[PDB]
Amino acid sequence: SFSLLSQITPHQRCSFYAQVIKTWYSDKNFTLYVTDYTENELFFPMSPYTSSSRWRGPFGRFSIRCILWDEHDFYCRNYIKEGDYVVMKNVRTKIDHLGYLECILHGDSAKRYNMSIEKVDSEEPELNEIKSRKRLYV
DNA sequence: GGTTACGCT
């Protein structure tokens, strides 16, 4: 069952639809910052005053960092782009040192958890709630 | 495994 990002908590597995706001690749992992334009008390409060010029929104507690390791990394690093919509399934949540929610995709060759992330065509009806909520913060 | 909300690789 899918959760809105507002509904996810730490130390569970969850699935959701989101829009990709920011990507960062490194030689250790691939990082996504995603939002569905719902607020979560454990998300970082992105500041409109000091955040990178490049981050245009959403501001406040509206986005979550996803760390993609291993195959998830190799698959998505030159595939998932800022602006894409994605569907993430059975991913892990945790809490970073500072106490903020974060989503993790660990390498899972034995396919124990059946995790996955895929692009969702911008015209899928599943994205309509995201698009309407987005209008409120732009 | 990797740190912090920027970097723009």
UniProtKB/Swiss-Prot annotation:
This is Protection of telomeres protein 1. One of its GO terms (molecular function) is telomerase inhibitor activity. Self-associates. Interacts with ccq1, poz1 and tpz1. GO terms for biological process: regulation of telomere maintenance via telomerase; telomere capping; telomere maintenance. Disulfide bonds: none annotated. Transmembrane segments: none annotated. Belongs to the telombin family. It comes from Schizosaccharomyces pombe (strain 972 / ATCC 24843). Its main location: nucleus. It is found in: Nucleus; Chromosome, Telomere. Keywords: Chromosome, DNA-binding, Nucleus, Telomere. Single-stranded telomeric DNA-binding protein that is required to protect the 3'-end telomeric overhang. It binds the consensus sequence 5'-GGTTAC-3'. Regulates telomerase and telomere length.
